[model samples]
Target: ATFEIVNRCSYTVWAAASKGDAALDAGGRQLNSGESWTINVEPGTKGGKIWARTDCYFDDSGSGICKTGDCGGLLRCKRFGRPPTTLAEFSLNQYGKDYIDISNIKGFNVPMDFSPTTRGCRGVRCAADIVGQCPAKLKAPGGGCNDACTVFQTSEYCCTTGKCGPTEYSRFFKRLCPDAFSYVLDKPTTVTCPGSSNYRVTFCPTA
Candidate 1:
């Protein structure tokens, strides 16, 4: 029997499988970004479960949960059909908004894998490339790069490794509107460094 897996998330994913309960103890393999995989199973060979995972940042802390009506996070696991199912559909929920927004910052510096050795400011710097020189500087400490920063500047512009930007406003745009053709608004008229022209800002009374 053969099984087909599809990645619905915006980024790449890693998957793995094993026989019996021992499978859980095995390591995982890397899957391509937005790519699919197929595996063959021996007939009547005590079918085992499959597990898939990915680490993509998101906007809100609760953005990718099914309860929130969003499915963009990494895929953990899902049950397939009988002993010989041709295709299995798995939908991975996206990460929370906080994950994506905070991770993508201009010159923020961070790691893509989000590993312990490469997390937080280190990861931010690694991802955004704010500490080093232009272009090369924007490249992460470990050679990771982000195209989120379309506009680069010495003091103001910083490159982003992931989709998220340095500011909350930028994160909002990325999360809410991924395909915004243009920006047209009145409020928030004065945009700071690395600002867009799509949203309108309304200044509220602050005591």
Candidate 2:
């Protein structure tokens, strides 16, 4: 049996394994940024356990630990893997986006959801604001987005002065998807952003 471990976080991780009543001391390995490794396992090794741990710092500024169980943002199980595998691949979508209810709010009358593109007047402007010209992993401190400024404080052409502005929406997406791009909808529909009337905007590091 063999095991392949992949670290998708922006930090390094450590791993260890246990079989039957025997447990091995935690081994240390450096997985730079985004990298993976393969380890050979003893044949006929069954009913074993694997565990992983990471020392990466998390953003506890908003709500709490962004875990998978709750509406949090961070991914769990940053360490460890299973055994008995020929070839397997696992990855973590760090900047995945999601929508929460924001209806019945004044000065925000576009729809139930919105994207980076919808925050600005045009696609280019929207992309520039939400998807600011920065690398996903190389951006400044604050999860790659403008940290000091709030999304509501920015400029926008779709709403009243300083009401439904770019900063607010951009901040919203920044909080939801961080350095990644995303699109919001009116009611969890399949519609895309930047369309007239019913769509929001999209801003990603790629687009």
Candidate 3:
């Protein structure tokens, strides 16, 4: 009862699902080039996150790690994926609508598109080229760019102060990725679609 993830990238992607209901649909799985994977996510599921792990190497045991978006060094993730990774975060079938987005507020590792497959729903996506031009200060090892607030950790960048907004770094993400979450306070980053709506999550949308 959820969305489909498609690997449109030239390389393989270790698609990960971080939350599930009693059935435990949360875990890491691999999708070859042009392959797709889908998992069941019951309604009202909260704190469910999905991201693709890149440059991964693992044996049949499902062990080892990925260059970007590794989950606690385990192939089957029992935790949230690392930062500098593109995230498609959602709270599906909650109340009456589903809230979803492609977030870069925590930084970006790849281009992605999170779109509603059903009509009458808005789409949020980011097809930017931030990985190559990532700022040095926010760069993560191997690849990806960490969110500015994550790197600076200042009262302003993180809005730890009484009130704060985008910094120079946050602005960079906002400019590059108008559709993703560019900052903690980036309003309108999260959009709502009708409950139980189908969505298509694609990596390397421009490729």
Candidate 4:
């Protein structure tokens, strides 16, 4: 399967992906607004997250930090990113189907749309103005909204017991993007599609 990662934001974004400790697409790439990168998923590739890092500055050797979704201060992310970054996640060719979902569980940085490009399958998007509407305590340092779990690390927010329910904070996110995985234990939001499908993830997507 192939994934076309597009940048539709007005500013630059470093698109990154990871699956089982291995970085995808040389870890990441610099995509100015209107640019895109395509990744061909290898067979047997497990699930992974695709996200964007904002307000980043990397030297010639690819070392720097991003305002949001910083991955070990490296331009070529080697691991899962920090919190408060929007995510598009997927698993390919599992039982003749592909599973895809949009997640705000880490929080919200860039608006996103994840959808199948080929097969007839549902698309999901989170295009709310989350950064501008973020609550006082859930606001990140710059241009990102933090999830309650990231802000408050308690079992109630973290769902450490595996039996937690939605909170007012999660409900806030759900209200804005009902299709997203708003919390760790939120209802299943994954969409299954035929294994023949390719996907597209648009950052800073519109309605």
Best by lDDT: 4
Candidate 2 ranges beyond 4 A from true positions: 23-28, 56-207
Give lDDT tens digits, candidate 1, residues 1-207: 344444443445445445433332222334554465655544332434343333433434423221110123322223221111011111111121111111222222211221111122211111222223324423433222222333343222232232322343344333432322111221121112111111110001011
**Tens digit of per-residue lDDT, candidate 2, span 11-127:** 444333344344322222335444645444443333333333333334543222311111122222222222110111111111332121221111111111122223322211112
The order of the candidates by lDDT, greatest first, is: 4, 3, 2, 1
Candidate 4 global TM-score: 0.96
Best candidate according to TM-score: 4
Residue 40, model 1: lDDT of 51
RMSD of each: 20.5, 17.4, 2.1, 1.2
TM-score of each: 0.25, 0.25, 0.91, 0.96
lDDT of each: 0.27, 0.28, 0.81, 0.89
Q: What number of clashing residue pairs does each candidate have, in the order they appear? A: 28, 10, 0, 0
User: Could you give me the TM-score of model 3 versus the true structure?
Assistant: 0.91
Taking the tens digit of each residue's C-alpha lDDT, what string does model 4 give over 1-207? Answer: 788999999989999988838887677899999999998777556678899999899999999988899899888887989988999998878888888999999999999999999967899999999889888889987769999998999998999998889999999899999999988988889998888688899998873
Between candidates 1 and 3, which one is better according to TM-score?
Answer: 3
Tens digits of per-residue lDDT for model 3 on 1-207? 557889999989888878633222748788898998877777888778888898999978888978888887667787877777888888877888888888886678878898888875887888888977888898888788898777878888777765887778988888888878787777777888888887888988886
Cα lDDT of candidate 3 equals: 0.81
TM-score between model 2 and native: 0.25
Candidate 4 wrong stretches, greater than 4 Å: none
